[PDB]
Amino acid sequence: PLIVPYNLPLPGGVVPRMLITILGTVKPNANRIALDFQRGNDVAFHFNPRFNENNRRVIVCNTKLDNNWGREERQSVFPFESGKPFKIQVLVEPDHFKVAVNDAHLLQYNHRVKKLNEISKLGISGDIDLTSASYTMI
Ligand SMILES: Cc1ccc(S[C@@H]2O[C@H](CO)[C@H](O)[C@H](n3cc(-c4ccc(F)cc4)nn3)[C@H]2O)cc1
Ligand SMILES: [Cl-]
């Protein structure tokens, strides 16, 4: 397994048609996972499954600019399960990140950070065993 937290460089940032694939297994009794697509210190797209927020499971997405989190976008469809293998696919489209989990569409997140070629890191964190993290063009 890869070390977590994991830093995947995205050379020259992201671009529409770029597909990022994360494979891993959720730990037993997991509490949280995060993907952080970063522009320097800013977080263009934070994708954060929370397994126990007031005894509910929710995915929280947001952007961090100059160290400040913005308006959250929340999704109660929650495709992860403790102890189970998953695939997250993040497809960069012209106007949003499109996320599918286990080949099922989950959510879109409109681009708030607009210099896509400066979003040149993906951080992967939390309660997973990380099998692989990679990108390809479709
Ligand atoms: C004014 C105010 C007060 C509190 C908060 S809470 C905040 O909410 C954000 C989304 O809006 C992010 O989720 C953020 N966060 C989570 C993680 C994380 C790191 C490793 C990991 F495995 C899972 C998750 N890193 N940063 C969380 O601290 C927000 C605003
Ligand atoms: Cl969290």
Here the CATH number for the domain that contains residue 65 is: 2.60.120.200
What was the elucidation method? X-ray
74 is in an annotated binding site: yes
Using CB distances shorter than 6 Å, the residues near ligand 1 are 32-34, 46, 48, 60, 62, 69, 72, 125-126
Structural domain total, the chain: 1
- Give the closest residue to 40 by CA, choosing from 18, 20, 66: 66
CB neighbours of residue 17 within 10 Å: 12
Q: C-alpha angle with apex 129: 123 to 132, nearest 5 degrees?
A: 60
Residues in the chain: 138
Sign of CA dihedral 82, 124, 44, 16: negative
Task: State which ligand 1 atom lies nearest to the alpha carbon of 61.
Answer: 10
Please name the residue whose Cα sits nearest to atom 24 of ligand 1: 34
What domain range includes position 112? Answer: 1-138
| d(CA 137, ligand 1 centre) in Å | 30
Please name the residue whose Cα sits nearest to atom 19 of ligand 1: 34
- Give the closest residue to 122 by CA, choosing from 108, 107, 137, 132: 132
Joined tokens for residue 96 = 């949003």
Please name the residue that has the structure tokens 């891993």. 24
Resolution of this PDB entry, in A?
1.1
**Which residues have CB under 8 Å from 55's CB, separation 6+?**
none
Please name the residue whose Cα sits nearest to atom 6 of ligand 1: 69
89 is in an annotated binding site: no
Distances (CA, A) of 16 to 51, 77, 127, 136: 30, 25, 29, 11
| d(CA 121, ligand 2 centre) in Å | 20
Q: C-alpha angle with apex 74: 49 to 16, nearest 5 degrees?
A: 80
